[PDB]
């Protein structure tokens, strides 16, 4: 419940503050102190364990993941595809 989740950007800003995966944005360069390969691998393992927890009780992933209100499954499928 509102924990500083791993591999998120930082200026705190808890949660899963990331946009739609069909974004025209930059390639998500690694943050404050980390190599890019460890960053994208840790992001991938993180999104896999949040999705495993998201298949059980999606209301807790609505109260964790910030912008949507509709569904967790397709959003994270697009993220795992990317």
């Amino acid at each position: 419940a509102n924990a500083f989740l791993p591999t998120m950007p930082e200026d705190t800003q808890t949660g899963h503050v990331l946009g739609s995966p069909q974004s025209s944005g930059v390639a998500e360069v690694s943050d404050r102190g980390q190599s890019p390969v460890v960053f994208i691998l840790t992001r991938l393992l993180t999104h896999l364990a949040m999705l495993v927890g998201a298949t059980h009780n999606p209301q807790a992933l609505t109260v964790i993941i910030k912008p949507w209100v509709q569904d967790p499954q397709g959003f994270l499928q697009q993220h795992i595809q990317r």
Binding site: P9, G19, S24, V29, P67
Partner: protein, 198 residues
């Protein structure tokens, strides 16, 4: 790399901001709601399409870069700015370059491009050159002052020109990146001979 791909579009958005400063040097008087209503409020059709091209460039750069600004920019800006994809029917005050409220979009974007460019030239100018005094202002930035290239025409053939193939007598194929030749090629075409922006 993906942010220096878009420094080519910086004199265009500075042409935008100079024309808006030159046109709208007022306060609480601009009565335009949305950008599309202002763009159709011009009679000379070439200037309409010119503003359309520059605003399409500005919206594409903004939709690209709107995630590093709130975590790496020095100007702390809120989250009601970059939580949507901007379009031609959005609000009009996002292009007038103010410094406190909702006009931090244009100013924060130009200042962050200047800060990225000046951080990388500072890294170059600390490693090997050790001194230079070449520094130009932001009043005469033409196209030839910013780091500009393309990836599918200008970056990929230089890097592809330095993958070296080595075959031993036993029979192998080792790919080696001789980093000195790629450094000398990348340095003496793009990122040497450039100013330190103020």
């Amino acid at each position: 790399e993906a942010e220096l791909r878009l420094v080519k579009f910086l004199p265009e958005i500075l042409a935008l901001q100079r024309d808006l400063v030159k046109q709208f040097q007022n306060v609480s008087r601009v009565e335009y709601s949305s950008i599309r209503g202002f763009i159709h409020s011009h009679s000379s059709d070439g200037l309409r399409k010119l503003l359309h091209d520059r605003i399409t460039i500005f919206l594409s750069t903004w939709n690209a870069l709107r995630r590093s600004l709130e975590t790496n920019g020095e100007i702390k800006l809120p989250k009601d700015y970059c939580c949507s994809d901007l379009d031609l029917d959005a609000e009009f005050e996002v292009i007038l370059p103010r410094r406190q409220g909702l006009g931090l979009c244009g100013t924060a974007l130009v200042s962050y491009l200047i800060s990225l460019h000046n951080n990388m030239v500072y890294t170059v100018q600390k490693f090997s050159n050790e001194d230079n005094s070449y520094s130009v202002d932001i009043s005469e930035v033409a196209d030839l002052h910013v780091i500009s290239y393309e990836v599918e025409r200008d970056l990929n053939p230089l890097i592809l020109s330095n993958c070296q193939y080595q075959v031993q007598q036993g029979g192998e194929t080792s790919q080696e990146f001789d980093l000195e030749k790629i450094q000398r090629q990348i340095s003496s075409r793009f990122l040497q001979g450039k100013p330190r922006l103020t």
